[PDB]
Amino acid sequence: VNSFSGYLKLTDNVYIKNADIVEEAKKVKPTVVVNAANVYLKHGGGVAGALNKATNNAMQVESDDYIATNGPLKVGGSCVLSGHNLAKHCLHVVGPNVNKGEDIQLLKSAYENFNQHEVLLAPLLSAGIFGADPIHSLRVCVDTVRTNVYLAVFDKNLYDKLVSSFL
């Protein structure tokens, strides 16, 4: 039993809700919140910009030190950093950005990072400003993640389409 509330159950391990991931994280304080990161951990917009803003830019400060030490992530890769005031940890995961021409096949590799964590609050990878089809992202999530994932979808219209079209 966990404290996630109001989710629709899609499969044994995947749950979905129309919610603002920032507000969800602040309420639940999950062990792991997933960020829709880029390889430079520049949290300018989309989910990343919103999460970082909620940390009063502390996420960005920590991220800049991480990059200065380690260099950029790989597309499809991840790193674990602090969750600041939102979660114990933030798993920064880089899905392919279609608006940069990146290979959508890397979306499965991106979701594989979730399997290193027993329970996660997450957005749909590569959705939103990353340019991929969110219906496809949900399919890859369900077919790749085996741990317990609670998906927050900001757009109510999109949430309804994701549910109604789910096979």
Ligand X SMILES: CC(C)(C)[C@@H]1CC[C@H](CO)N(c2ncnc3[nH]ccc23)C1
Smallest separation, CB 46 to ligand X (Å):
3
Q: CA distances (Å), 57 to each of 14, 26, 80, 85, 90, in order?
A: 30, 16, 17, 11, 14
The total number of residues shown for the chain amounts to 167
**Identified binder of ligand X from the candidate list 155, 156, 160, 165, rule CB under 6 A:** 155
Judged by CB under 6 A, which stretch of 17-25, 65-73, 91-99, 109-117 contacts ligand X? 17-25
Q: Is 20 in the site for ligand X (CB under 6 A)?
A: yes
* CA-wise closest residue to 111 among 127, 100, 129, 99: 127
Q: Is 104 in the site for ligand X (CB under 6 A)?
A: no
Q: Is 154 in the site for ligand X (CB under 6 A)?
A: yes
Can you list the positions of beta strands (E) in 12-129?
14-18, 32-36, 78-82, 89-93, 119-122
Planar angle of CA 21, 4, 138, nearest 5 degrees: 55
Smallest separation, CB 78 to ligand X (Å):
17
* CA-wise closest residue to 150 among 128, 117, 127: 117
Which pair of structure tokens corresponds to residue 15?
Answer: 């749950």
By CB under 6 A, what part of segment 21-80 binds ligand X? 21-22, 46-47, 50
Smallest separation, CB 56 to ligand X (Å):
17
**Identified binder of ligand X from the candidate list 67, 129, 135, 163, rule CB under 6 A:** 129
Binding site for ligand X (CB under 6 A): 20-22, 46-47, 50, 123-124, 127-130, 134, 152-155, 158
